[PDB]
Ligand binder design. Structure first.
Ligand SMILES: O=C(Nc1cncc2ccccc12)[C@@H]1CCOc2ccc(Cl)cc21
Ligand SMILES: O=C(Nc1cncc2ccccc12)[C@@H]1CCOc2ccc(Cl)cc21
Lengths: 304, 304
C-alpha cells in the first residue's frame, strides 16, 4: 500500500542523453539510433530569439557547427535537417544504448515522466501531466531544453515530449518528437496565452479510487449522481466534463473497489461543494489530477 | 522555475537490480561488485514469519538454494552470510554495471529516491523522506522487498535504504545496506509501534524558501520571531524543534532570497496558526516537509 507520484525508471532514457552545442548555445539532445533530436532554437542567439527566422538561421549552419557530445566522446555529425521545431542531426554512429522506442503524441490529461537534463547530464526524474491547455507544470531551469518526457511499456520507451520553453507564467511548453508543439505555443520569446486550464476529472476520480484501495475512505458517502448532474457541478468548478468513455476507463477501478463510477462521482461532487474540511486524502489537502486510471492500476498492481 | 518532488535518475541503480529466490519466496537483490544484498527474510516461508529464528533457518540453506537472476542470466552463488537483517550472497561474477557507490546510514528528516522493484525488475522511482520516527511513506506491494533507497553525488551512488516490511498502519520500514533497521522495527510479522511522527521543520522552511524563489510569496508577512517563540508554536503543532544548526543549513536559501531565517519562521508560525485559508503554495494545500535545504538548492540551481 501507499501511493506516490511515481515516475518510470529513467535508465533507458539516460543512455540516450547527449549535449548539443551550436555557437554560444548549449542544450540537451536525444540520441536514438544514428539520429540526435534536439530543439531547433539551439541555433539561435538571445538576440534573434525575439523573432527568429529558423530556416534562414539554419542556412548559416554546417554539420561541423553542431557539437554533439555523448558523455565525454564527440559524435561526428554527417547530416542535419529541421522538422517543425526540432533538429535531427544524423551522426555516423548508432547509439549502442538505443532502447526499443516509439514517438507518440500524448493526449491532454495523459501523464508522463520527465528526465530533466543539463549539459547532456541527467539531474532528476519526476512525473507530470499534459494539462488540458497543453502546458506542463514542470521543474526546468535554463539549459534544460531538450529534456524529454516518456512512458515505458515493459521494454518499449514511448517518447512523447521534448522541452522547449518556459512561459512568463512559470509553466512549460514543448513539442512531440516530430517537433510539433503541444498547444498554440511558438518558439519565440514573446507573450503567449496558455489558455484556461481545467481539472482532469477522470484522473481525480481515479485517484479517489486509489485512496479507497490504500485505506482513505472518509470521503465516501451515501449518495449517487447522474453524468448530467455531475457535469453541472464539474462546470461550476472548472473540471473537464465527464463522458461515458471516462466512466468506461474507470471500469477496472470500479470493479476493484465495488464502488460504481457514478457513486464515486457523488463523492467528488460533495468534496467539490464542501471542500476537504481540513482533512487529507493520500497525504494531500487537495484533489489530485495527475494520475490516470491506468497509472492507478499500474501502481496498485505492480507492473514492471 | 517550477518545483517538483524530483527523484535522482535511477539508471545506475537499475543496473544493480537482481531477483533472489529461496524456496517459495522471491524478492529483489542489489548486485554490487561480486556481492548480492537482499533482505534475509527471503529464506522464510509465511508460516515462520510469525517468529523466525533466522540463524536456524539459514543453516538449512546452501549456496545452491539461493537463485539469483540478473535479467535472464543466472548468477553462480559461491558464498552466503547474514549481516544483521540482510543476506550477502557472494557470486562468482562482479556486476559489470556496478557504479561508484557508498553505504550510508541517513539521518531522520533526510530524503532519498526509491527504485521500487518486483522480481528484480524496476517499476518506478519516487522521492521520499526518512520520517523522524524512522518509517518511510512509500509505495510498495508484495514482492517489493529488496527495493533500495539512494542519493547520487555526481557519479557516486550512496545507498541508504533497503525495503523490508510494511506495517499494519500502511507505512514502510527497512534497513541500511549493513542490515540494521531504521527505527525499532524487527523482521517479524507482529504489531510494531512506529511512534509519534513529527513535521520536519527545517524542510518546511526550505520548501517555503523554494516557494519564494519560484514565485509564491503570499505567505510572507511583516513579522519576525525568535528560536524560543517559534519552538513554542512548533511544540503545539508537532513540528521538530528548530535549532541553530537548522538555521545554519538554511543560510544559502536565506542568502538567495534575502529573507532572514527567523523572518521565514514567523511566516511558518502564521501559517501554522491560521492555516492556508484555502490557498496553495507550490501547488500544495499543506506544508510540505520532504525537501531538505540541500534538495531545494540542488533543484533550484540545476546540479547534475
Ligand atoms: O524558455 C527558454 N528556456 C527555458 C526553459 N525552461 C526553463 C527556463 C528557465 C529559465 C530560463 C530559460 C528556460 C528559452 C529561453 C527564453 O526564450 C525562449 C523563447 C522560446 C523558446 Cl522555444 C525557448 C526559450
Ligand atoms: O511486509 C512484508 N512485505 C511487504 C512490503 N511492502 C509492502 C507489502 C504489501 C503487501 C504485502 C507485503 C508487503 C513481508 C510480508 C508480511 O510479513 C512481513 C514481516 C516482516 C518482514 Cl521483515 C517482512 C514481511
Amino acid at each position: 500500500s501507499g501511493f506516490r507520484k511515481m515516475a518510470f525508471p529513467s535508465g533507458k532514457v539516460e543512455g540516450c542523453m547527449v549535449q548539443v552545442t551550436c555557437g554560444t548555445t548549449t542544450l540537451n539532445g536525444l540520441w536514438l539510433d544514428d539520429v540526435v533530436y534536439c530543439p531547433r532554437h539551439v541555433i539561435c542567439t538571445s538576440e534573434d530569439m525575439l523573432n527568429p527566422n529558423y530556416e534562414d538561421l539554419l542556412i548559416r549552419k554546417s554539420n561541423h557547427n553542431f557539437l554533439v557530445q555523448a558523455g565525454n566522446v564527440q559524435l561526428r555529425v554527417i547530416g542535419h535537417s529541421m522538422q517543425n521545431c526540432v533538429l535531427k542531426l544524423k551522426v555516423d554512429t548508432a547509439n549502442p544504448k538505443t532502447p526499443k522506442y516509439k514517438f507518440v503524441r500524448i493526449q491532454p490529461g495523459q501523464t508522463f515522466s520527465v528526465l530533466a537534463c543539463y549539459n547532456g547530464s541527467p539531474s532528476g526524474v519526476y512525473q507530470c501531466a499534459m494539462r488540458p491547455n497543453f502546458t506542463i507544470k514542470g521543474s526546468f531551469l535554463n539549459g534544460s531544453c531538450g529534456s524529454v518526457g516518456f512512458n515505458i511499456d515493459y521494454d518499449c520507451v514511448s517518447f512523447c515530449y521534448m522541452h522547449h520553453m518556459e512561459l512568463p507564467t512559470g509553466v512549460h511548453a514543448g513539442t512531440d518528437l516530430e517537433g510539433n508543439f503541444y498547444g498554440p505555443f511558438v518558439d519565440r520569446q514573446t507573450a503567449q496565452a496558455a489558455g484556461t486550464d481545467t481539472t482532469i476529472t477522470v484522473n481525480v476520480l481515479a485517484w479517489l479510487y486509489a485512496a479507497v484501495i490504500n485505506g482513505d475512505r472518509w470521503f465516501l458517502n451515501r449518495f449517487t449522481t447522474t453524468l448530467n448532474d455531475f457535469n453541472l457541478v464539474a462546470m461550476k468548478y472548472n473540471y473537464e466534463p465527464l463522458t461515458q468513455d471516462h466512466v468506461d476507463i474507470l471500469g477496472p477501478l470500479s470493479a476493484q473497489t465495488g464502488i460504481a463510477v457514478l457513486d464515486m462521482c457523488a463523492s467528488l461532487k460533495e468534496l467539490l461543494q464542501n471542500g476537504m474540511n481540513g482533512r487529507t486524502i493520500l497525504g494531500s489537502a487537495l484533489l489530485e489530477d495527475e494520475f490516470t486510471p491506468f497509472d492507478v492500476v499500474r501502481q496498485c498492481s505492480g507492473v514492471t
